[PDB]
Design a protein around this ligand. Sequence first.
Ligand SMILES: *[C@@H]1O[C@H](CO)[C@@H](O)[C@H](O)[C@H]1NC(C)=O
Ligand SMILES: *[C@@H]1O[C@H](CO)[C@@H](O)[C@H](O)[C@H]1NC(C)=O
Ligand SMILES: *[C@@H]1O[C@H](CO)[C@@H](O)[C@H](O)[C@H]1NC(C)=O
Ligand SMILES: *[C@@H]1O[C@H](CO)[C@@H](O)[C@H](O)[C@H]1NC(C)=O
Ligand SMILES: *[C@@H]1O[C@H](CO)[C@@H](O)[C@H](O)[C@H]1NC(C)=O
Ligand SMILES: *[C@@H]1O[C@H](CO)[C@@H](O)[C@H](O)[C@H]1NC(C)=O
Ligand SMILES: *[C@@H]1O[C@H](CO)[C@@H](O)[C@H](O)[C@H]1NC(C)=O
Ligand SMILES: *[C@@H]1O[C@H](CO)[C@@H](O)[C@H](O)[C@H]1NC(C)=O
Lengths: 294, 50, 128, 148, 99
Amino acid sequence: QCVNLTTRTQLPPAYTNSFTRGVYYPDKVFRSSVLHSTQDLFLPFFSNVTWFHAIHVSGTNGTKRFDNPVLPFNDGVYFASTEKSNIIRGWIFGTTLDSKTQSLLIVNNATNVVIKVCEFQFCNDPFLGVYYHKNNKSWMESEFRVYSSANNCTFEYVSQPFLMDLEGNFKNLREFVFKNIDGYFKIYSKHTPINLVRDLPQGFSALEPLVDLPIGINITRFQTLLALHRSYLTPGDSSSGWTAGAAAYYVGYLQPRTFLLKYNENGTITDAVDCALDPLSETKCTLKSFTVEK
Amino acid sequence: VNQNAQALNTLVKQLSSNFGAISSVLNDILSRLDPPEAEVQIDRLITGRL
Amino acid sequence: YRVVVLSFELLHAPATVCGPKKSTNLVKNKCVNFNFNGLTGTGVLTESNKKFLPFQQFGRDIADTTDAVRDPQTLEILDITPCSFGGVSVITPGTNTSNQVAVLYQGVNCTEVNVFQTRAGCLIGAEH
Amino acid sequence: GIYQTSNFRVQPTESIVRFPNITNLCPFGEVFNATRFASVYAWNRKRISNCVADYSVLYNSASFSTFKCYGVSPTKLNDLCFTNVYADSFVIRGDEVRQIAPGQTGKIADYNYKLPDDFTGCVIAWNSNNLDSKVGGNYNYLYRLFRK
Amino acid sequence: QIAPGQTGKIADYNYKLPDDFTGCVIAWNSNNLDSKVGGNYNYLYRLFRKSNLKPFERDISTEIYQAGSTPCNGVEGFNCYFPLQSYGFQPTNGVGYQP
Ligand SMILES: *[C@@H]1O[C@H](CO)[C@@H](O)[C@H](O)[C@H]1NC(C)=O
Ligand SMILES: *[C@@H]1O[C@H](CO)[C@@H](O)[C@H](O)[C@H]1NC(C)=O
Ligand SMILES: *[C@@H]1O[C@H](CO)[C@@H](O)[C@H](O)[C@H]1NC(C)=O
Ligand SMILES: *[C@@H]1O[C@H](CO)[C@@H](O)[C@H](O)[C@H]1NC(C)=O
Ligand SMILES: *[C@@H]1O[C@H](CO)[C@@H](O)[C@H](O)[C@H]1NC(C)=O
Ligand SMILES: *[C@@H]1O[C@H](CO)[C@@H](O)[C@H](O)[C@H]1NC(C)=O
Ligand SMILES: *[C@@H]1O[C@H](CO)[C@@H](O)[C@H](O)[C@H]1NC(C)=O
Ligand SMILES: *[C@@H]1O[C@H](CO)[C@@H](O)[C@H](O)[C@H]1NC(C)=O
């Protein structure tokens, strides 16, 4: 059963730069020491991705409320998370997000992943109430407060956790790409230790595929599931939550682009070129080479 | 040498084109379609490749 | 009478109930018809020293032919070469002198086909 | 001179097929080998999805007095991967078995469970004399004769 | 189905037509000549053969077909069926079922 939270008050949007992030392997074909051009849905290079704190302290009094905005799903989504305490737990995907239409749910607790396709009656503020045990504190018991009821379940998937245990400046970068093509929900992912970089870091990490769900549902909009360590009945003055939402998550939107990927001898995509970024990249794509002579 | 290499490379890439057929793979079209339609698709591929 | 009615749905939707995928024995180092995870082809298979990343199934170094592929049952990586082909040439003096001929097989070994192996191919019927 | 007359190839004689291990066993034993079958008005529909379905076990078991398939032949069903399959498990009298097929009438075909004229699927039943009958009479299976 | 390039029980098991046919197919309704009140089952058809027909092949074999794994030995039974079923031509049949 769900619990009502406070009004989101429509916080103004904030943007940040995505320096060469969101590149995934498009095929399952081993390619070695060659340059391949693919036209698919990628996140454009140096794009504006909108970033939200998991917990935002903005009121004069010092109110702590989850920034859990309801966000569209336009032809794929690049979802990055910089956290250190496992306060982001999963996502919900759907068109109406009520009992009328089917929807996809992904949650991650300490042991396994729960993926369900059902007609959930989600509340306005879905979340997981997280509590430690009195003696061990090694794992984190979770109370699911996402949906009031579920009916007409047509899918069920359990596997190893999507999110590693994060149990103090050891922030972690989790990068995922979600696509919904031809009735398949494709998930690409990569995990990287980060250090002293508040925003998205500069570099190249290729997203290896995780899983393809034959969900066969329509997805237009999505939301993020967060873990509440504090109490909704009694909100503390401060420090009841996790350090005023130091962790954050970034979302950018995939668009149709042609990329030139460079597979190295060991089969990994080590570099990419976005043909529509600048005239140099256009020349590189036309010549099918990373270097251009005079 | 470069030109000759290009001359071959493009040629082989022309095997991946549909030329209006359902598939650029003759074996896939046959393993799918009976003769009286696989023949039309194979004719399209033959025209393109020739 | 114990009765079960199995209603089968065939729609323009991805299939979740599927029949058995009958497979056969592996034949290595031989010219055979192969069907690996839906790729059908004709060729010989050899053991390869390539390393595939876990999400990778096939291989294309030249981007126009699948040189290597991972076997579905056993996770070994095996490559693929085309079954030896090549033109056949007849080397002849004018028939107005003799009807004896030699046969040259271009760019093939003398095992796939008074034999002389040259860089041009396998020559049969002509003395070295 | 030299003349290119023909082309040399090696035609293959044998074909090999390799597929990954058969894993996702479809629920069939829980339907056909079930200990209890519901009444003819609380009919059991069980949805079967996300599993590989072996049908030779059923069609070549010779324990089914009815194998009647409409829209599909019973021998090519192994060569198809459907979106879903609904397994309908019950018990019914023998003289009424001929009523489970599309386009038919009768107290079962009209007042229990109607099959549309455009069915695609299979009806299969087996004699449950030694499983569902008792000496004093098994009246746990209920039947309607009247509806509006 | 009586045309080249088509598939089905007759184009495969009763009359195979080659894709290169030259000639004309003619057919008309025969309700008042062939159909009887009690049904004329003098016209028999096949539902199961071992393989598809080659064009203009006329197979008149009555061997009992093997649907299962055990041999039939010319005898019906479990997964053993005669090759030919009868047609219920009746003068009250619909457009689909009249001869
Ligand atoms: C990205 O956002 C900045 C403001 O932070 C803006 O100046 C710039 O034009 C934006 N670029 C794109 C491509 O939207
Ligand atoms: C994780 O969640 C599932 C339900 O989503 C629950 O059944 C399971 O017990 C949870 N894990 C643990 C270790 O309790
Ligand atoms: C690829 O990996 C091998 C060891 O597995 C190593 O010898 C080689 O240098 C590597 N190449 C790269 C990507 O540096
Ligand atoms: C298939 O099963 C064999 C054992 O019979 C095992 O060695 C192999 O790894 C399995 N392959 C897959 C893909 O599960
Ligand atoms: C070629 O053969 C012809 C007979 O067909 C003969 O007249 C002629 O002398 C021969 N010439 C030579 C050079 O062998
Ligand atoms: C193929 O030809 C080479 C000569 O280049 C020779 O060394 C080799 O033994 C031949 N292969 C076989 C199987 O005889
Ligand atoms: C050529 O002479 C060498 C000895 O010098 C001999 O081994 C070889 O067999 C000879 N080849 C031919 C074709 O006579
Ligand atoms: C039911 O159990 C028997 C064991 O005697 C087995 O032969 C048969 O295949 C089973 N049926 C199903 C549908 O699993």
